Symmetry: C2
């Protein structure tokens, strides 16, 4: 499944690729928590439904931070 595991004070960058039925595309960037950032991307997509129809989305990861702590 596609699951975002929230962390406090997270800062995530969302690159949205909008692909229209005729093959044309548009890209936009959103930043903030994963929840807020994706919400804005979806809200934007919704403003385009009137002229471009229903949309579906696939979320794919691109970057992570690994915090590795040694005990000594």
């Amino acid at each position: 499944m596609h699951h975002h595991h929230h962390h406090a004070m997270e800062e995530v960058t969302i690159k949205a690729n909008l692909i229209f039925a005729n093959g044309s595309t548009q890209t936009a960037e959103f930043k903030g928590t994963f929840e807020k950032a994706t919400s804005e991307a979806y809200a934007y997509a919704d403003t385009l439904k009137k002229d471009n129809g229903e949309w579906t989305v696939d979320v794919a990861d691109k970057a992570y931070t690994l915090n590795i702590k040694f005990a000594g």
Copy 2:
């Protein structure tokens, strides 16, 4: 839970922050599939166990690509 959902031809960037018992740190970057990139990060961490002890890790997301397709 922390779950990486694999996608074909994915290219993920891993930023590893190694935190030692005495407070000092070291950072490194790894790239490739999430699986390969994290594997290299862990392998690197293992080479430091002899002198720095056991390590634990927390994986946190940083960036995503959203592919939004309109049906028309």
